[PDB]
Design a protein around this ligand. Structure first.
Ligand SMILES: CCCCCCCCCCCCCC(=O)OC[C@H](COP(=O)([O-])OCC[N+](C)(C)C)OC(=O)CCCCCCCCCCCCC
Ligand SMILES: CCCCCCCCCCCCCC(=O)OC[C@H](COP(=O)([O-])OCC[N+](C)(C)C)OC(=O)CCCCCCCCCCCCC
Ligand SMILES: CCCCCCCCCCCCCC(=O)OC[C@H](COP(=O)([O-])OCC[N+](C)(C)C)OC(=O)CCCCCCCCCCCCC
Lengths: 235, 235, 235, 235, 235, 235, 235, 235
């Protein structure tokens, strides 16, 4: 019942809002020497790990327009819920990004940690990089959220927050490691700096997409009906 | 004779060209932890110290549209030589900035070390900061280039390259420490990023100006004729 | 029957049209000393109080894209009627704003009383302010339009026009007190001055929204079915 | 000697700087009811009256690119001094306008009291109005600064600050009463709002001009040589 | 059957195409003295009169996004057919306008007879004028296309082409007499001159609309069910 | 003496001002049938014929930046006087164009009779046309203003106003017949419609130029020294 | 089943991707003398011939938003499949165009073989040309894909790849021979050069459209029901 | 005498005009296979060779703002004559480019043979390339125009037209081989395509400059006074 749909939508609004707030608010590279990298990288992972322990208990804790797209291709969600989530994540983001702005001194709140391709990196490589970052990440979630799979994986939250962290350990250097359009979106709107911005929807969309592909049919397929299950779209 | 005017103009073209090249090419903050600050800061000082040991022996080694302006108000140069120098420094800069570009890998040659005001800093403070940076700097040159003054100052080049370095030790954080329009100019032209750029002419112009003022009349005045000397403009 | 839907839509077109016309046409701050504030503030309240005595008898007299949104989240209207109303209010506004323009001398019809954030106020505070203005206002309407509640409230029209007036007594200083997108919209279109304009949809949308929330579930909830009632959307 | 030229230029820089600062800083219409009009109007007059008691003792205290133009046509100044003054007034203005900005809270420092034509007023009337404002004003200065004229005029400063004040008592309603390009210039540059801005150079330029005309030849002519005196331009 | 829907759509594409072609191609005011007015005015009427004798026999011969809107409010058409017609008229227009362009020498095919508000006329009057032009015109069609009405009206085509002509006899002076968005559209697209262009959709839309109103309910109402007939929208 | 230079400059300001005012104010094609052509064409001629009877008695009555250029190449004027005239004609124009604007109802004062190339005419032909128009015109003035030539030419004013008129009888159709940049300038500035505007400086500049050429050396040369006379530039 | 819909969509993504890649990657006119024409012309034909032998075995191998539109009017597809194909071809294109970019040296990958109208050709002729190119091409596919027709046509792939080739043999000179919006689209997006770009959707859309017309009803009609078959749209 | 200055200026106007006309009008690459290269390359050389046989007999036949700059640094011309030439070459160019336009069918007169950097070439290399092209070219002219040098060089015209041709044989591939700003200028103005245009002033300016350097002092110096000769600037 709606007491579920609208909860999940809010859990997705709050879960994304905090994600941006904490993640982004740690990324304000206030610390040059000790690579912000291990810092912001685990920040984003723990942030996600907590939100999944917390929210993944109600909505799924996608907090990522890429993952929500990845479950949609995945013939797991409804295009409705799948669009409610993206608007709730985008609103979450921007909101968590507004708050961070209101709480952090100017001198720190620069560009709000806006994802920006690395200097010599160009957009195609950038886009390549964001593809692999979302793919490994979307592949990790599909595999931890996948019931049939079980035994001893421990914690989905870590099993998934470390995926996000590995994403950044690598991709903060190539693209700042957005791998979440919401997250690239939010500070693109508040700073009005939409430069090389599309790299961040395409890259993770295609990544997410050809990640739910590389799992659902390629790696760990489905043992009943594929055409029958696609009826979830119609409801 | 012109064999002097045109030398000085070239010495100013080369002396500025290298200045940008070395200075800027060190500033490419390839090193986060060990503050680029002590690095790029002494880079700019040594760069200047060498150019002054080298070129200050022929033209004066201003390599700075602010200093050339400071000597002009200073009723020391001709508005001609004073304009030849600025166009030779701007051309020097851009040229030394073109070369650096051609020699440094993309991944390193980001924005070419473009002077950009610090995040929470606004333009007026920025402008304030650039004023004090050029003032202390233009004051140090006036006082080391000032013959009547003597005894034991040691080396003008250091006596002046440390001034530039103190400028950066402070002002790389507020404004990136341009304190040389040429230097802010050159990468503004190659990257086509003229944002908050005027802060860098005003700030150092006014600094230079009210620096040749704070010395020539205020601190260490002139003991003959002030109105008579101003005849240098007419030649 | 449509003889109701289309009436309400017109009542909403006229009711909004007059609202803008009277409200806005009083706000033309022709009177500096005696704060336009008590003036335009009661103007907007009486205007609303009359339109509600008048029109609230047929459509609801929302004359405010924020209130119409607030009843929609409120699971009280149909997304259809809810969109018919907003287009009828926007058309009402602009029309009532066109007329005012045609009747008032230039020297008076300046910017048509365009909502503009106060000088030192920034957009986030502005947005904050518009949130609280629509919240208290949308909360007052929900509570006066709420049947179960009764006894001795007197007049909904006043019980609601004073809410609008309190909105302005406060918010004309922070944001000009739009708290009605229609009202900010109309003179934004005729003067082509859409500056800081979004502050006026967001601010009151979120206000209206988290106002129908703070009442419907928080303060004075519903005693039957929440998931069942949401079937009104489907008709 | 330059000890005079450069003094006057500074006296004109400071005298204009304060003028903008005080004038403009009073005009921040912090007081609606009691017409800012008598307030800002005498502010600008006293400001001028003081600057003339003060500076008119050294440079002339034009603090107005219109008056400096008016003395130039007036075949009283050199095109050099006449251009030094305008750049010193424009720099004065902007500087006095920067300071005001740094000292006054946002909530007060709105548009910095930017001259803006009145609503129904159009640009030609506006331009007409600024013409008459500078004409009466430039006529009053010519007549108080005019030696041959004497007897009992009392104080030039008042004899001239009341002229400025009468200018505003009238023209703050039509154009905000710039009648000083410097003064319209300065907040046009800091707020980057050059709307209907030219109205403020033309209007007062033509006013000043056909004001030094209406006096020098029309009303109170010259009794020696007109063609001979014009040799002042050549020095 | 579609053999009707798609015919009408083509009849509307051709019928509009010729309308623009002939109408517009006569309006190329190649004749100053003999007012183009009687000329282009009857051109547009005959053009319409012929297209209605011709096409009004199959689709209705609206050849006017305003009339098609007028029948839609009129609860006579389907929103589908009503949108098919407008896209077929817009395509008709542009096509008939392309052809005219390809057949008429440059020296003649100026702006393609683009509707442009008259000089001193402003947009609101313009919009007023286009309202009355479409109203009288949409009122004439409703009344000639209205079966219950009969007896001796003679020819609908004239009974309707004279309406168009009276529209122009009047409105070519105020607005060029578009009274057909298609017709204002087509040369707005080929000449890329969309100036005061909206005046031509609004004006005739509102005219058409409050014209099908002034007839359907006001003047010559309906004697069965109004709410029941509105079921045509659903098919 | 200046009592001559400054007179001529004013005579050129007024003489141009009226020219635009009368000429342009007749050209407001209030009369379609009776070609505005004979009308505006003689208007411009008489206007010129009067201004030359009137002003050509003091300054030369060029009232045309093209003719003033034509006398300059003509080694007849000083580059100073030649620039004073153009700024006085441009100011004259705009002023005479402002006045016309203030005196003529909107409905008449459309685009202020802005010169605009004819529809099928392109810019090169246009430019060609304006060349021949200024050439025949500049040739007629050179030949009527040329003393050595005499006998029985009657009236220079007609001998020159008919030249202007023949210019228009022809060129109002190709280019509106500017053949006076001042005249194309003035309504280009007030209406802010600088379209195909350069056609009007080039075309008449080159015309004027290669017109003072086709006369001074080609047709009716000079019988003393050509290199010696060019000393007029130096004074 | 979807195992068909989604295959076809991919076959259309890959089939278009290669088409652009091979076609476009041959068209990089690396060879001036030997007309690129026979080269790129057969390249595009073989490319298509192979993709049809290959993919036309599963989806139809439209690889052309024009052909997919042509089958849609053709009442052969569903508007859904018809839109899935165009987004899959556009994505195919851009992707095949991205790859080509990543594999071909700069010096070769100029504008990516962007369709651009020929110099003296204008847009209407261009549009005319693209119409005939898509018409003959869409007519050839309709006739080879048309079962009832049979006997001895040999190979559809050639029977269709030669059609594409004849298209280019002709139209590379007039328009570069896009005749495939996907193909004009892809390098318009990567080079950001959308000049005269619409010529390439219109031209081939209208061509395709009035090509499925010239066959389905005109030349080789249908012998059962036309209105009944149109039920495919509803599924 | 001027009978020389003004001749040379015209000879430079015509000599440049034809140069553009013939050169450019041959370059209209109407012939793909037989490299336009040998064609346009000798076209530009012969064009120059003829203009030098023809005009180099009066003005020098620079027909190149780069060469005129090269003689200026060369302390051979006056900054006056040196600026007269550039404006006469730019006017020559554009004029010869206008004519070509008026004589050549559209289908041929594409972009007017606009210099455009080669695809993979970037601007710095481009600029590098244009430097070497003007250097070898400016070096060849200095050495053929250099009297002291003699004996048996044959024809300066060839001795110089082959230099231009070698310039193109090489540089039409890298930059289209402008090596004449006039020549890049002229079609940049008529086609309004100023893309990568500065590459063509810088590149050849610096080339010309450091070419008159590499000869005058480096390779074949001067045996009298260098400071004394520079007095030519003062006349
Ligand atoms: C299905 C996908 C599976 C994923 C697996 C594929 C991953 C590999 C993709 C790598 C991206 C290639 C782009 C690149 O690293 O270099 C492109 C090229 C660089 O020059 P060059 O190496 O060709 O030769 C010059 C050699 N020399 C420097 C020694 C002289 O040109 C330039 O402008 C510089 C780069 C500008 C961006 C171009 C992006 C191309 C789009 C990627 C293709 C993906 C298709 C969707
Ligand atoms: C769920 C919501 C419940 C509603 C209850 C919350 C109401 C409170 C919200 C207040 C808005 C905060 C914005 C503000 O008043 O000041 C932001 C900050 C000012 O500097 P500072 O105070 O941080 O420190 C400098 C201190 N010193 C001046 C002494 C040196 O930066 C600036 O640029 C100036 C302001 C520019 C606009 C920034 C808006 C932030 C977005 C609001 C957050 C709402 C999330 C949707
Ligand atoms: C239902 C369709 C069936 C297809 C069969 C029709 C195929 C024929 C269409 C031909 C296109 C006509 C455009 C054209 O070749 O020349 C247009 C015109 C050229 O001047 P002129 O020949 O009229 O007279 C000047 C004569 N003199 C040069 C000797 C002085 O004007 C200009 O600006 C130059 C051309 C600029 C583009 C204009 C395109 C017009 C739109 C085409 C119509 C299609 C309707 C959808």
């Amino acid at each position: 019942r709606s007491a579920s749909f609208w909860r999940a939508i809010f859990a997705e609004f709050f879960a994304t809002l905090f994600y941006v707030f904490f993640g982004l608010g740690a990324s304000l590279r206030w610390a040059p020497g000790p690579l912000h990298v291990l810092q912001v990288a685990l920040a984003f992972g723990l942030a996600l790990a907590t939100l999944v322990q917390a929210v993944g208990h109600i909505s799924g804790a996608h907090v990522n327009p890429a993952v929500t797209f990845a479950f949609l291709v995945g013939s797991q969600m409804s295009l409705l819920r799948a669009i409610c989530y993206v608007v709730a994540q985008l609103l979450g983001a921007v909101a968590g990004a507004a708050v961070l702005y209101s709480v952090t001194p100017p001198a720190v709140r620069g560009n709000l940690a806006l994802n920006t391709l690395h200097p010599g990196v160009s957009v195609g490589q950038a886009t390549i990089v964001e593809i692999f970052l979302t793919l490994q990440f979307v592949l990790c979630i599909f595999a931890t959220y996948d019931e049939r799979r079980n035994g001893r994986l421990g914690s989905v939250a870590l099993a998934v927050g470390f995926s996000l962290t590995l994403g950044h350990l690598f991709g903060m250097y190539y693209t700042g490691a957005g791998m979440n359009p919401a997250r690239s979106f939010a500070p693109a709107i508040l700073t009005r700096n939409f430069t090389n911005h599309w790299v961040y929807w395409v890259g993770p969309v295609i990544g997410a997409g050809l990640g739910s592909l590389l799992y659902d049919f390629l790696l760990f397929p489905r043992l009943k009906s594929v055409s029958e299950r696609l009826s979830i779209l119609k409801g």
